[PDB]
Amino acid sequence: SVYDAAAQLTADVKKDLRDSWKVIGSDKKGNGVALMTTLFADNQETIGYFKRLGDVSQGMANDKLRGHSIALMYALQNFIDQLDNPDDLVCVVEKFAVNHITRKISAAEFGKINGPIKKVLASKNFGDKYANAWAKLVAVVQAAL
Amino acid sequence: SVYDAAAQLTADVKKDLRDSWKVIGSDKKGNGVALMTTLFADNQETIGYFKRLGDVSQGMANDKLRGHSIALMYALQNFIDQLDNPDDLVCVVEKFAVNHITRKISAAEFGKINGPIKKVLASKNFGDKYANAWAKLVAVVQAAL
Ligand code: HEM
Ligand code: HEM
């Protein structure tokens, strides 16, 4: 269950999540867009899912892509803030899960976000340990898909 | 025009929005649910739009409503953080406007949230001055509907 996934997150993992988010979460517009464009660059097969945002190659100049990228970072902000209460993390994770379930996004496809995250983290010198911490948070969402 | 509405957010208004947000934003789960239940209580005709959340009369005991409510508070958090830049404020407002346009929510009905907000602020000792500042932020979203 999603609860099992959340309840598993340990103190050391929450620590790494919080420490890395302090940095990558401080520039939501910049890092959010970088996350999205990196996803499009390495997984071109996903572009079709974002037709609403228009031309995603426009990057920062694309207002729709900019608005989406910022809202995504607040969804992650929401997750980070709920870390100490599995009950709250679960209901927010499930809320956002529905947003992707309606778009027919499977658990496997959602996990494609791990690559971009690993790269953004690296650009700030957060190594594999931190990428693994984030893969665990992503897995919580996957448990709901 | 969403851009002209955003222009209505002067130095004084932005200050009042930030000061009051520091208090209400500190308990996103509690005040978020307070907002929603007050909306449903004083405007029963809107309950129908929220079919997905199930029985909203259960308030805090409804996991779907709680998740939704928290998420809503992070959307407000997003607006507050974008007050410095009118261009970013507009792209995020338009992002969430689309979420309501697809649900057939008009500018007039979206405005029904002003009542709940005034009440929640009042319960925290913030008067008409703050309720009116929030009415202006809400108006920016209305202009995009
Ligand atoms: C940590 C990673 C992710 C987070 C936190 C996240 C968050 C979000 C949020 C907040 C929305 C807006 C929901 C709405 O308003 O309807 C959204 C929409 C969407 N997401 Fe994700 N997402 C993530 C990863 C992904 C991945 C990997 C895919 C691709 C397979 C995906 C596909 C979509 C699609 C297609 C939309 C709809 C965009 C639109 O038309 O507006 N997401 N996501
Ligand atoms: C302070 C003003 C408001 C904010 C910031 C806000 C924010 C949000 C957010 C972030 C979502 C989730 C979007 C999604 O995932 O699809 C949402 C959904 C929704 N909102 Fe609002 N909202 C506000 C006021 C209202 C009002 C006044 C109404 C109706 C009279 C309304 C009707 C809806 C509906 C029907 C949904 C979809 C619920 C669902 O099926 O999950 N909203 N809102």
PDB file of N, CA and C in Angstrom, chain A residues 15-64:
ATOM      1  N   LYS A  15      16.077  13.096   6.070  1.00  0.00           N
ATOM      2  CA  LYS A  15      17.137  14.075   6.259  1.00  0.00           C
ATOM      3  C   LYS A  15      17.710  14.482   4.901  1.00  0.00           C
ATOM      4  N   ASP A  16      18.118  13.496   4.103  1.00  0.00           N
ATOM      5  CA  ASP A  16      18.675  13.780   2.785  1.00  0.00           C
ATOM      6  C   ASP A  16      17.663  14.493   1.887  1.00  0.00           C
ATOM      7  N   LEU A  17      16.389  14.120   1.992  1.00  0.00           N
ATOM      8  CA  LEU A  17      15.357  14.758   1.179  1.00  0.00           C
ATOM      9  C   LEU A  17      15.247  16.239   1.548  1.00  0.00           C
ATOM     10  N   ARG A  18      15.213  16.515   2.849  1.00  0.00           N
ATOM     11  CA  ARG A  18      15.108  17.880   3.350  1.00  0.00           C
ATOM     12  C   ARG A  18      16.323  18.736   3.021  1.00  0.00           C
ATOM     13  N   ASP A  19      17.516  18.174   3.193  1.00  0.00           N
ATOM     14  CA  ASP A  19      18.738  18.915   2.907  1.00  0.00           C
ATOM     15  C   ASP A  19      18.872  19.270   1.432  1.00  0.00           C
ATOM     16  N   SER A  20      18.557  18.325   0.552  1.00  0.00           N
ATOM     17  CA  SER A  20      18.672  18.585  -0.878  1.00  0.00           C
ATOM     18  C   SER A  20      17.570  19.517  -1.381  1.00  0.00           C
ATOM     19  N   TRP A  21      16.373  19.399  -0.812  1.00  0.00           N
ATOM     20  CA  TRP A  21      15.266  20.254  -1.225  1.00  0.00           C
ATOM     21  C   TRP A  21      15.505  21.704  -0.809  1.00  0.00           C
ATOM     22  N   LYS A  22      16.269  21.898   0.262  1.00  0.00           N
ATOM     23  CA  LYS A  22      16.587  23.244   0.732  1.00  0.00           C
ATOM     24  C   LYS A  22      17.222  24.025  -0.410  1.00  0.00           C
ATOM     25  N   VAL A  23      18.020  23.319  -1.203  1.00  0.00           N
ATOM     26  CA  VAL A  23      18.718  23.919  -2.327  1.00  0.00           C
ATOM     27  C   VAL A  23      17.904  23.917  -3.619  1.00  0.00           C
ATOM     28  N   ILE A  24      17.571  22.736  -4.132  1.00  0.00           N
ATOM     29  CA  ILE A  24      16.817  22.671  -5.379  1.00  0.00           C
ATOM     30  C   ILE A  24      15.409  23.239  -5.265  1.00  0.00           C
ATOM     31  N   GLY A  25      14.909  23.357  -4.040  1.00  0.00           N
ATOM     32  CA  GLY A  25      13.576  23.899  -3.848  1.00  0.00           C
ATOM     33  C   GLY A  25      13.577  25.407  -3.654  1.00  0.00           C
ATOM     34  N   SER A  26      14.765  26.005  -3.580  1.00  0.00           N
ATOM     35  CA  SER A  26      14.876  27.447  -3.381  1.00  0.00           C
ATOM     36  C   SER A  26      14.679  28.250  -4.664  1.00  0.00           C
ATOM     37  N   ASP A  27      14.819  27.594  -5.812  1.00  0.00           N
ATOM     38  CA  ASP A  27      14.607  28.257  -7.094  1.00  0.00           C
ATOM     39  C   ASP A  27      13.657  27.365  -7.876  1.00  0.00           C
ATOM     40  N   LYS A  28      12.380  27.431  -7.510  1.00  0.00           N
ATOM     41  CA  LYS A  28      11.350  26.616  -8.135  1.00  0.00           C
ATOM     42  C   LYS A  28      11.145  26.858  -9.625  1.00  0.00           C
ATOM     43  N   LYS A  29      11.242  28.109 -10.059  1.00  0.00           N
ATOM     44  CA  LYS A  29      11.067  28.405 -11.473  1.00  0.00           C
ATOM     45  C   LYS A  29      12.237  27.826 -12.261  1.00  0.00           C
ATOM     46  N   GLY A  30      13.448  28.117 -11.803  1.00  0.00           N
ATOM     47  CA  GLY A  30      14.633  27.629 -12.476  1.00  0.00           C
ATOM     48  C   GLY A  30      14.766  26.119 -12.481  1.00  0.00           C
ATOM     49  N   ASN A  31      14.720  25.507 -11.302  1.00  0.00           N
ATOM     50  CA  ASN A  31      14.865  24.062 -11.208  1.00  0.00           C
ATOM     51  C   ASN A  31      13.670  23.277 -11.735  1.00  0.00           C
ATOM     52  N   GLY A  32      12.477  23.855 -11.628  1.00  0.00           N
ATOM     53  CA  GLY A  32      11.293  23.176 -12.124  1.00  0.00           C
ATOM     54  C   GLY A  32      11.357  23.033 -13.637  1.00  0.00           C
ATOM     55  N   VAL A  33      11.680  24.126 -14.321  1.00  0.00           N
ATOM     56  CA  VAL A  33      11.774  24.108 -15.775  1.00  0.00           C
ATOM     57  C   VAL A  33      12.897  23.178 -16.228  1.00  0.00           C
ATOM     58  N   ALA A  34      14.015  23.199 -15.506  1.00  0.00           N
ATOM     59  CA  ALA A  34      15.143  22.337 -15.832  1.00  0.00           C
ATOM     60  C   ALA A  34      14.710  20.876 -15.746  1.00  0.00           C
ATOM     61  N   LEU A  35      13.881  20.560 -14.755  1.00  0.00           N
ATOM     62  CA  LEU A  35      13.390  19.195 -14.593  1.00  0.00           C
ATOM     63  C   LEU A  35      12.570  18.786 -15.807  1.00  0.00           C
ATOM     64  N   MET A  36      11.638  19.646 -16.204  1.00  0.00           N
ATOM     65  CA  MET A  36      10.774  19.354 -17.339  1.00  0.00           C
ATOM     66  C   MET A  36      11.501  19.266 -18.681  1.00  0.00           C
ATOM     67  N   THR A  37      12.406  20.202 -18.954  1.00  0.00           N
ATOM     68  CA  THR A  37      13.129  20.165 -20.221  1.00  0.00           C
ATOM     69  C   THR A  37      14.081  18.973 -20.281  1.00  0.00           C
ATOM     70  N   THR A  38      14.599  18.556 -19.128  1.00  0.00           N
ATOM     71  CA  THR A  38      15.499  17.410 -19.097  1.00  0.00           C
ATOM     72  C   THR A  38      14.688  16.150 -19.384  1.00  0.00           C
ATOM     73  N   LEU A  39      13.444  16.127 -18.912  1.00  0.00           N
ATOM     74  CA  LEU A  39      12.576  14.984 -19.148  1.00  0.00           C
ATOM     75  C   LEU A  39      12.268  14.880 -20.637  1.00  0.00           C
ATOM     76  N   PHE A  40      12.042  16.023 -21.278  1.00  0.00           N
ATOM     77  CA  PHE A  40      11.731  16.041 -22.706  1.00  0.00           C
ATOM     78  C   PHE A  40      12.955  15.690 -23.548  1.00  0.00           C
ATOM     79  N   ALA A  41      14.131  16.086 -23.073  1.00  0.00           N
ATOM     80  CA  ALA A  41      15.374  15.821 -23.787  1.00  0.00           C
ATOM     81  C   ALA A  41      15.777  14.348 -23.753  1.00  0.00           C
ATOM     82  N   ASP A  42      15.612  13.708 -22.599  1.00  0.00           N
ATOM     83  CA  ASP A  42      15.986  12.304 -22.446  1.00  0.00           C
ATOM     84  C   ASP A  42      14.865  11.308 -22.703  1.00  0.00           C
ATOM     85  N   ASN A  43      13.625  11.778 -22.666  1.00  0.00           N
ATOM     86  CA  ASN A  43      12.482  10.910 -22.909  1.00  0.00           C
ATOM     87  C   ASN A  43      11.501  11.597 -23.844  1.00  0.00           C
ATOM     88  N   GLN A  44      11.944  11.799 -25.079  1.00  0.00           N
ATOM     89  CA  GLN A  44      11.139  12.455 -26.096  1.00  0.00           C
ATOM     90  C   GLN A  44       9.770  11.815 -26.286  1.00  0.00           C
ATOM     91  N   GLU A  45       9.641  10.540 -25.931  1.00  0.00           N
ATOM     92  CA  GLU A  45       8.362   9.861 -26.098  1.00  0.00           C
ATOM     93  C   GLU A  45       7.268  10.436 -25.197  1.00  0.00           C
ATOM     94  N   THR A  46       7.653  11.223 -24.194  1.00  0.00           N
ATOM     95  CA  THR A  46       6.674  11.805 -23.279  1.00  0.00           C
ATOM     96  C   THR A  46       6.102  13.155 -23.725  1.00  0.00           C
ATOM     97  N   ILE A  47       6.784  13.830 -24.647  1.00  0.00           N
ATOM     98  CA  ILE A  47       6.326  15.133 -25.129  1.00  0.00           C
ATOM     99  C   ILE A  47       4.840  15.171 -25.508  1.00  0.00           C
ATOM    100  N   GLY A  48       4.379  14.153 -26.229  1.00  0.00           N
ATOM    101  CA  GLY A  48       2.987  14.103 -26.644  1.00  0.00           C
ATOM    102  C   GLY A  48       1.967  14.243 -25.524  1.00  0.00           C
ATOM    103  N   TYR A  49       2.355  13.860 -24.312  1.00  0.00           N
ATOM    104  CA  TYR A  49       1.463  13.942 -23.154  1.00  0.00           C
ATOM    105  C   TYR A  49       1.210  15.375 -22.704  1.00  0.00           C
ATOM    106  N   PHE A  50       2.106  16.275 -23.084  1.00  0.00           N
ATOM    107  CA  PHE A  50       2.014  17.670 -22.674  1.00  0.00           C
ATOM    108  C   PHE A  50       1.576  18.644 -23.761  1.00  0.00           C
ATOM    109  N   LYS A  51       0.742  18.183 -24.686  1.00  0.00           N
ATOM    110  CA  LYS A  51       0.281  19.042 -25.770  1.00  0.00           C
ATOM    111  C   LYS A  51      -0.384  20.336 -25.292  1.00  0.00           C
ATOM    112  N   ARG A  52      -1.014  20.306 -24.120  1.00  0.00           N
ATOM    113  CA  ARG A  52      -1.676  21.501 -23.596  1.00  0.00           C
ATOM    114  C   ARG A  52      -0.691  22.651 -23.409  1.00  0.00           C
ATOM    115  N   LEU A  53       0.528  22.319 -22.996  1.00  0.00           N
ATOM    116  CA  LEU A  53       1.554  23.326 -22.757  1.00  0.00           C
ATOM    117  C   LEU A  53       2.127  23.939 -24.033  1.00  0.00           C
ATOM    118  N   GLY A  54       1.695  23.448 -25.191  1.00  0.00           N
ATOM    119  CA  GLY A  54       2.194  23.988 -26.443  1.00  0.00           C
ATOM    120  C   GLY A  54       3.612  23.555 -26.775  1.00  0.00           C
ATOM    121  N   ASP A  55       4.390  24.459 -27.365  1.00  0.00           N
ATOM    122  CA  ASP A  55       5.770  24.164 -27.747  1.00  0.00           C
ATOM    123  C   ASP A  55       6.703  24.138 -26.538  1.00  0.00           C
ATOM    124  N   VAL A  56       6.960  22.948 -26.003  1.00  0.00           N
ATOM    125  CA  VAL A  56       7.828  22.825 -24.835  1.00  0.00           C
ATOM    126  C   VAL A  56       9.306  23.083 -25.105  1.00  0.00           C
ATOM    127  N   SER A  57       9.677  23.270 -26.366  1.00  0.00           N
ATOM    128  CA  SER A  57      11.080  23.541 -26.665  1.00  0.00           C
ATOM    129  C   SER A  57      11.354  25.019 -26.386  1.00  0.00           C
ATOM    130  N   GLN A  58      10.282  25.778 -26.158  1.00  0.00           N
ATOM    131  CA  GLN A  58      10.385  27.208 -25.867  1.00  0.00           C
ATOM    132  C   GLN A  58      11.015  27.450 -24.498  1.00  0.00           C
ATOM    133  N   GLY A  59      11.100  26.395 -23.696  1.00  0.00           N
ATOM    134  CA  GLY A  59      11.685  26.514 -22.372  1.00  0.00           C
ATOM    135  C   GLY A  59      11.039  27.570 -21.494  1.00  0.00           C
ATOM    136  N   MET A  60      11.882  28.355 -20.833  1.00  0.00           N
ATOM    137  CA  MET A  60      11.457  29.415 -19.927  1.00  0.00           C
ATOM    138  C   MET A  60      10.482  30.412 -20.561  1.00  0.00           C
ATOM    139  N   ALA A  61      10.651  30.668 -21.854  1.00  0.00           N
ATOM    140  CA  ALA A  61       9.805  31.611 -22.577  1.00  0.00           C
ATOM    141  C   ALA A  61       8.353  31.162 -22.693  1.00  0.00           C
ATOM    142  N   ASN A  62       8.122  29.860 -22.563  1.00  0.00           N
ATOM    143  CA  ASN A  62       6.778  29.303 -22.649  1.00  0.00           C
ATOM    144  C   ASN A  62       6.075  29.503 -21.305  1.00  0.00           C
ATOM    145  N   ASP A  63       5.148  30.456 -21.256  1.00  0.00           N
ATOM    146  CA  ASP A  63       4.423  30.757 -20.028  1.00  0.00           C
ATOM    147  C   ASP A  63       3.659  29.559 -19.468  1.00  0.00           C
ATOM    148  N   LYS A  64       3.040  28.773 -20.344  1.00  0.00           N
ATOM    149  CA  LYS A  64       2.296  27.601 -19.903  1.00  0.00           C
ATOM    150  C   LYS A  64       3.233  26.564 -19.290  1.00  0.00           C
TER     151      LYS A  64
END
